[PDB]
Amino acid sequence: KLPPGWEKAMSRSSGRVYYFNHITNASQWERPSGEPARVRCSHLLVKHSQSRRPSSWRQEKITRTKEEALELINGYIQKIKSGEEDFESLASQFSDCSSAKARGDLGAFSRGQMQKPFEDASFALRTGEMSGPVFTDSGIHIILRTE
């Protein structure tokens, strides 16, 4: 009936149906559209105190909690979806990954090289599409599939 990982849901505040993806944590109002050996993605990572390594080029010692990291990820997604901010601009200023220097770009990758929640969400995105919060042992990611 629907592409991989999508399900219908109901808005609590409006009562309108929307669509949610349980692999990429994306959600949207309109019915979704329509696998490759490699995909190319960029991401914005916000680390927290239970990250596998709680440090980044932004902070010698990352102290925020998982919940606070999710709040920051959530706000970045809001500004991206309203057009007030561009994904690349936010990944460059605020991503806790060294790939901030490349506007969040990671290059092309195949299955079996990334942390697996990241991998599954990347390959479940369509080209040009962005995820919601995706959780790994590094922290919380926003993923943009560029190829």
Ligand SMILES: OCc1ccc2c(c1)OCO2
């Ligand atoms: O952390 C991984 C990583 C991937 C691509 C990059 C990078 C870091 O920095 C320059 O481009």
Ligand SMILES: OCc1ccc2c(c1)OCO2
């Ligand atoms: O495997 C997923 C993944 C990709 C790139 C990353 C990362 C995790 O942590 C920071 O850079």
